[PDB]
Amino acid sequence: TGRGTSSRFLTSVLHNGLGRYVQQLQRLSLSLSRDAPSSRGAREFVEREVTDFARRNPGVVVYVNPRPCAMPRIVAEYLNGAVREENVNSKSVEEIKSLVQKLADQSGLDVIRIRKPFHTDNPSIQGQWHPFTNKRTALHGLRPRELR
């Protein structure tokens, strides 16, 4: 499946942790139905947990739209431009609450095979190895068997 799929290297959006950490999630949309058994669990989430989540995360704008609906759905958008969409059909409050927290922590970068765990832009402090390191020089720079 690796040869059947794309891959990338480990990175961060804008050097997130160097100076100050910025939260990538910026918008949430949740759609509901007033009276539909499928969306009962989402309704309870609005009743109890929606306001508390908004306060703990003040950089995210949350939209709640009751309307005639068949499947409740959540849309998450990020600063780098990614968009993610999830169905919430007939799920419990606990399931939805835990799902939302995962979205907050994520950065919009694609979830695919990552080639290496570690990324460094300054791998060497003493100088990268080349063949001439560890080779002694010679007087007058005479290559082997040169008479001079």
Partner: protein
């Protein structure tokens, strides 16, 4: 003909996917699409960065002159520009960026510390930084996608609005976090273009009253083949200052000059890492 409508419904969705790939839709600004409230979006912008802004000032920054022209033309069939804030914001950034660089690299020449500031205030860096902070989404203009000169202007206007509200010390942290970070992993001459590096080196050595260097061939391999390696070292007063690798003697010798210059100005690869630790 099978009974049921659910399979027909599913297939309509796939036909939608196929059509999009073949005929990608033209870009649209997020304001047009649903789930948009301008007032709420602006407030989250400030809180996202852990900085406090005055709402009246911040909104003015996003407005652009071209936007006013479009509205009036539609109107025939008040506002207030960000021009004042743009000039103030850009001016401080140039001075603030220069102050950072000189302390870090005092020896480095004046022309150098102008190229780096020009490099870090160009469209490439500013436009790239602006988009990932949502500045493009909140901009008001007559053309979308926003042209880079327009996008760049609105970015510095925002810094100007931050300067007025919270003063110099806060803005200096803002420039460090978002603009100075962009030089991580960048070699000096990648940001500053110098032709004839040897000529510059000779003048610099004269100022400190040092003798002109003597070029010599420290190491050699495969000279007569089509893939040769050369090491050239600049010797001063029979003392080594720099050593450089290259394909040809001329290329390798030029490489030694750049190595020497970097050490003189203290912009080496193994130099002390920049400091973001200070909370003040």
């Amino acid at each position: 003909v099978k009974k049921g409508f659910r399979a027909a419904f599913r297939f309509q969705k796939e036909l939608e996917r196929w059509r999009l790939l073949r005929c990608p839709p033209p870009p649209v600004r997020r304001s047009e699409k649903p789930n948009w409230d301008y007032h709420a979006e602006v407030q989250a912008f400030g809180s996202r960065l852990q900085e406090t802004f005055s709402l009246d000032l911040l909104k003015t920054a996003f407005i652009n002159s071209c936007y006013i022209k479009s509205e009036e033309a539609k109107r025939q069939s008040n506002l207030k520009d960000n021009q004042e804030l743009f000039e103030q914001g850009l001016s401080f950034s140039h001075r603030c960026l220069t102050q950072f660089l000189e302390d870090e690299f005092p020896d480095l020449p004046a022309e150098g510390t102008e190229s780096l500031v020009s490099f870090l205030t160009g469209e490439a860096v500013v436009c790239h930084v602006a988009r990932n902070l949502a500045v493009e989404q909140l901009t008001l203009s007559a053309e979308f996608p926003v042209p880079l000169p327009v996008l760049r202007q609105t970015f510095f206007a925002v810094i100007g609005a931050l300067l007025q509200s919270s003063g110099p010390e806060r803005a200096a942290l803002f420039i460090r976090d978002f603009l100075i970070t962009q030089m991580t992993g960048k070699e000096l001459f990648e940001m500053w273009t110098v032709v004839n590096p040897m000529g510059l080196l000779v003048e610099e050595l004269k100022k400190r009253n040092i003798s002109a260097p003597e070029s010599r061939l420290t190491r050699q391999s495969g000279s007569t083949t089509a893939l040769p390696l050369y090491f050239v070292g600049l010797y001063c007063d029979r003392k080594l200052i720099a050593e450089g690798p290259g394909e040809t003697v001329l290329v390798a010798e030029e490489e030694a000059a750049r190595v020497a210059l970097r050490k003189l100005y203290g912009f080496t690869e193994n130099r002390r890492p920049w400091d973001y630790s200070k909370p003040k």
